[PDB]
Nucleic acid binder design. Structure first.
Ligand SMILES: Nc1nc2c(ncn2[C@@H]2O[C@H](COP(=O)(O)OP(=O)(O)NP(=O)(O)O)[C@@H](O)[C@H]2O)c(=O)[nH]1
Ligand SMILES: Nc1nc2c(ncn2[C@@H]2O[C@H](COP(=O)(O)OP(=O)(O)NP(=O)(O)O)[C@@H](O)[C@H]2O)c(=O)[nH]1
Lengths: 417, 178
RNA sequence: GGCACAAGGGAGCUUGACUGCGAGACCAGUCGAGCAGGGACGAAAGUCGGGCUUAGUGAUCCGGUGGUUCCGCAUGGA
RNA sequence: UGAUAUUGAAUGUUGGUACAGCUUGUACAGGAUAGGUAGGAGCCUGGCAUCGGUGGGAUACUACCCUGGCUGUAUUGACCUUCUAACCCGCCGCCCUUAUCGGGCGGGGAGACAGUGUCAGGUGGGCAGUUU
């Protein structure tokens, strides 16, 4: 499929153009550093029903070398490299520095000029012929002007389950993902906050395709009073809604922090399969009964989720990394499973017989409604008599009658009707 | 090792020869926003200026001293040929057309652009006055006298400084190479 | 329930599937001739803001969606 | 855990910054794969030189700032290893004085550390304000 990439110095509204191409994916803010740290992928079409889009960060002379490397890598796969530049400020030395790479790149290049929001000063498309490229074009993300001609200029050169990953910042999420698809795809830095939004990639494993997304970490709500840079957290929360398997990552060197329990709450309340994951065993000791020290401690603190399997692996030394997916596939089935109506009812009155302590609440019927998560409805004389202690009791029996491992369960109650 | 004076270097670039005395000046991109690039008429001062005048503006262009104006479009004569001569100026109406239709001014340094005072409605006043962050400026000849290049470098430096770029902070002066 | 001259189902034209108000009704909104410019058209007449009627998440607080003498700080610049 | 002040000297290591003086920047082509950025007015002191050249860049020589390095100059920083003079003694002797308070004068021990005043995370139902 065709590949198209956008490059240039920062603050030229590259991500703005990328978004109005389709939807609203990349975060759009106005500041010199607030650029997309790495490359992203998407799909597009204009009368060809087939195109792909790639967005990167700004290029200049903190960390900028990794962004430059990503921009260079994106220049490889792209068929045409839309090269967007400001119009109001004319040209710049950094523009020539950017143009040097394109000069050394033997691929077709289309030049575009942004910040042309009205007709009159649209006539400012001049002096860009010195760059050595073809005819420039006008575009404005605020009003979507000149889009058809630009897309025609691009066209003239025309030739599965999703699982997420969350956690508190600086626990190795980015290192874990790029040490798993076995390549460099996302950035890794010592300072917290390296990632700035969701990164999506697709891949096939054991003749099965998969989708993996990173979420740049999550910190406490109270102390997140940043300069709208926490606007990315909304993007991270969005990925959970589109994901169906959630991987929570905890550091092994550090103990269980209170914020980790809160983060795991969001996944549980969303009715999504969870697999608790811990990283960085290279720091703390690996020995006998050190397995159970954190294995037991997690159970004591993380009571609300017990179905989640516990996996240990360190991304730095690549120990037991290949064991992550075996957990994932098993969790995939249990989140979408139905049990027979006959069998499910037969188990219900066995539980209530040995516990005849529900006037007295009456159980009459039981069945399943949804596949994911497995919702069940029980017809009773009155749902007011239902007690949260007894409601939890029903869940344990169901979770013990069958496997139902690594997935939450919800029980609904209906009146006599 | 020694930085000479202005009154000594004009008499000494007589001796650095009929050659042309030119000035380099290192400016102080970060500052591209307030960059320093430009042209000004000169005091102590052969070109061939060809104009792209449109409408009535050709009628005052043929009497000021220009060599060839045109038949309102000779970019087709520019295509496959066109030994360009000295200087290309234009007017703010056909500039957009000449820019797109003309595809031979980028790496040749004659593309009309109204940032330089060369694309305007005053074509009669424009013919008569033309005849990494660095600026080059020809101020004159070897055969000029000692009092000519002093006013020439004074006028060009006052033009540079008159234009004290925004973000004036930090040193503005780095080097003068006569 | 109902549309036979069809309230399917299509398009050549693919927007009179747009432009300024609106007498007058029904019910907080909705309906509706007239109707001023320009006319999608159709050859001319003439039609004219599309799924039948049809529930389709929102005030509180009020934060984006299109820009302009739209304006006053001692005046002028922002 | 971090800064900052209280807060010192010596040598050893030791970077950064600034000002200097020398070097590098690999263009099909092109005078050795010996830079962009203003170019075009010289040999014969062993050699051979001098236009110009598919070249976007040759200089029959006039004539600026960069980029990475190498040498000096100053600034400071980071450190180690010491010392001593603040700062600290619920250690000893003497005097206030008859006094397990306190304060002076001597020894000793620690010594730029700890302790103290203003700025980040976690911690932890530590203790409050709260309603569903
Ligand atoms: N007036 C105006 N502003 C625009 C336009 N397009 C973008 N901007 C402004 O430019 C800002 C920066 O754009 P953004 O897409 O965030 O660029 P970026 O995140 O730096 N990505 P990149 O560095 O690759 O260019 C936006 O916040 C917006 O205010 C436009 O057409 N008109
Ligand atoms: N000891 C150890 N260190 C690791 C491991 N994985 C990463 N690190 C280091 O710890 C830091 C974590 O980097 P990163 O993957 O970006 O963690 P993150 O910030 O939580 N992810 P993101 O960048 O997406 O926000 C980096 O400095 C990395 O070098 C690991 O398995 N063990």
């Amino acid at each position: 499929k065709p590949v198209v990439a956008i490059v240039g110095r920062p603050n030229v509204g590259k991500s703005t153009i990328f978004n109005r191409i389709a939807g609203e994916r990349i975060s759009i803010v106005e500041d010199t550093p607030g650029v997309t740290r790495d490359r992203i992928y998407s799909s597009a079409e204009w009368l060809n029903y087939d195109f792909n889009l790639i967005d990167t960060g700004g290029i200049d002379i903190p960390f900028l070398a990794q962004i430059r490397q990503q921009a260079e890598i994106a220049m490889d796969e792209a068929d045409v490299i839309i090269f967007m530049v400001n119009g109001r400020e004319g040209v710049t030395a950094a523009d020539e520095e950017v143009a040097k790479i394109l000069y050394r790149t033997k691929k077709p290049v289309v030049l575009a000029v942004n910040k042309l929001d009205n007709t009159e000063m649209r006539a400012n498309i001049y002096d860009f012929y010195s760059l050595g490229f073809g005819e420039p074009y006008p575009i404005s993300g605020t009003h979507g002007l000149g889009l058809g001609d630009l897309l025609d200029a691009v066209a003239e050169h025309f030739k599965v389950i999703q699982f997420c990953l969350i956690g508190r910042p600086n626990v190795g999420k980015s290192s874990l993902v790029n040490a798993m698809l076995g390549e460099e795809r996302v950035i890794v830095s010592n300072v917290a906050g390296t990632t700035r939004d969701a990164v999506d990639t697709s891949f096939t494993y054991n003749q099965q395709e998969f989708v993996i997304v990173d979420t740049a970490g999550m910190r406490k709500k109270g102390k997140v009073y940043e300069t709208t840079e926490k606007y990315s957290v909304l993007r991270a929360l969005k990925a959970i809604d589109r994901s169906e398997v959630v991987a929570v990552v905890l550091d092994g060197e550090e103990g269980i922090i209170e914020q980790d329990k809160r983060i795991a709450g969001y996944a549980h309340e969303a009715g999504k399969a969870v697999v608790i994951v811990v990283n960085k065993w290279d720091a703390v000791d690996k020995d006998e009964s050190t397995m159970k020290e954190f294995e037991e401690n997690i159970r004591d603190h993380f009571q609300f989720l017990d179905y989640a399997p516990i996996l240990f692996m360190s991304a730095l030394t690549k120990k037991r990394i290949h064991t992550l997916m075996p957990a994932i596939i098993k969790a995939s089935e249990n989140h979408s499973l139905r049990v027979q109506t006959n069998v499910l009812n037969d188990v219900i009155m066995d539980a209530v017989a040995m516990n005849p302590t529900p006037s007295r609440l009456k159980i009459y019927y039981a069945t399943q409604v949804s596949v994911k998560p497995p919702s069940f409805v029980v017809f009773v004389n009155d749902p007011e008599l239902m007690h949260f202690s007894y409601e939890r009791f029903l869940e344990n029996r169901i979770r013990d009658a069958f496997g139902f491992e690594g997935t939450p369960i919800k029980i609904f109650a209906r009146a006599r009707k | 090792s020694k930085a000479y004076d202005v009154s000594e270097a004009v008499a000494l670039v007589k001796k650095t020869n009929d050659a042309t005395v030119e000035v380099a000046f290192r400016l102080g991109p970060r500052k591209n926003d307030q960059q320093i690039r430009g042209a000004v008429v000169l005091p102590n001062g052969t070109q061939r200026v060809l104009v792209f005048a449109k409408g009535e503006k050709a009628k005052e262009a043929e009497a000021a001293g220009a060599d060839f104006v045109g038949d309102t479009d000779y970019i087709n004569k520019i295509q496959q040929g066109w030994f360009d001569f000295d200087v290309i100026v234009a007017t703010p109406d056909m500039m957009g057309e000449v820019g797109k239709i003309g595809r031979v001014l980028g790496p040749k340094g004659l593309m009309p652009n109204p940032k330089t005072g060369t694309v305007t409605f005053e074509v009669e006043k424009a013919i008569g006055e033309i005849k990494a962050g660095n600026i080059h400026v020809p101020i004159g000849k070897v055969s000029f006298e000692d009092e000519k290049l002093v006013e020439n470098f004074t006028t060009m430096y006052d033009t540079i400084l008159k234009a004290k770029p925004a973000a004036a902070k930090g040193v503005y002066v780095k080097n003068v190479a006569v």
